[PDB]
């Protein structure tokens with residue numbers, strides 16, 4: 001009823017939306033993985049009379065529920081989606097999106113890694129993001145490649161109209177005391193990549209992690225702190 005939703009308000013298979021700013025929402029869903037349940041976030045950004053989606057809802061059925069929740073709560077069509085890295089919490093549901101008429105995008109690096117892993121594969125390649133510090137415009141957002149962090153391909157997303165920074169899984173929530181799922185991470189490079197984010201988006205007012213509660217710019221330093229402690 002107004003607070004940012006958590007697993008306890010989200011059974012696996014339901015999706016909730018949360019208004020971040022004018023024309024900016026996060027989507028929250030839950031999924032089971034290796035016998036434990038986790039929340040995950042994505043983003044929705046108004047693009048005139050259309051919507052841009054950032055990341056799936058972690059699974060085909062969750063992503064179908066996401067589209068249904070968007071129709072219920074917003075009522076504008078999702079025309080494009082960007083996946084910010086290759087794991088299932090970002091691309092699982094791309095097939096559902098593609099069958100719903102959504103054009104799906106990711107960097108070539110994400111597409112290659114998704115294909116190699118057996119995950120669903122966005123249709124279109126996002127060029128211009130292969131070097132750390134690269135940025136490109138995509139509808140109402142800027143996509144930024146900070147360097148290797150949670151994964152080698154992770155992208156972050158900035159909504160300049162609202163100073164909203166969606167860090168994806170390269171950014172952790174303030175309550176975290178570990179670095180999450182680090183199987184594909186570069187713990188040595190991650191702090192440098194976070195520093196690049198901090199330098200590029202110093203005016204960010206809301207920072208949204210890939211999992212957990214949004215906050216302010218402090219999430220960036222906190223992430224560097226937990227990653228460094230994990231590496232150690």
Ligand SMILES: C[C@@H](c1cccc2c(-c3ccc(CS(C)(=O)=O)c(F)c3)c(C(=O)O)[nH]c12)n1cc(CNS(=O)(=O)CCN)nn1
Nearest residue numbers: 033038087088089169172176177178179180181183210211
């Ligand atoms: C789907 C995704 C994934 C699944 C389950 C959990 C996560 C997590 C995660 C996020 C937060 C916490 C709480 S916290 C900051 O306090 O720790 C946490 F405890 C874990 C992440 C992530 O951090 O963003 N991602 C999660 N995933 C898959 C792979 C590679 N697959 S693999 O089977 O593991 C190795 C085989 N190659 N990596 N990530």
Ligand SMILES: [Zn+2]
Nearest residue numbers: 085087150169
């Ligand atoms: Zn991941």
Ligand SMILES: [Zn+2]
Nearest residue numbers: 089169210211
């Ligand atoms: Zn993640």
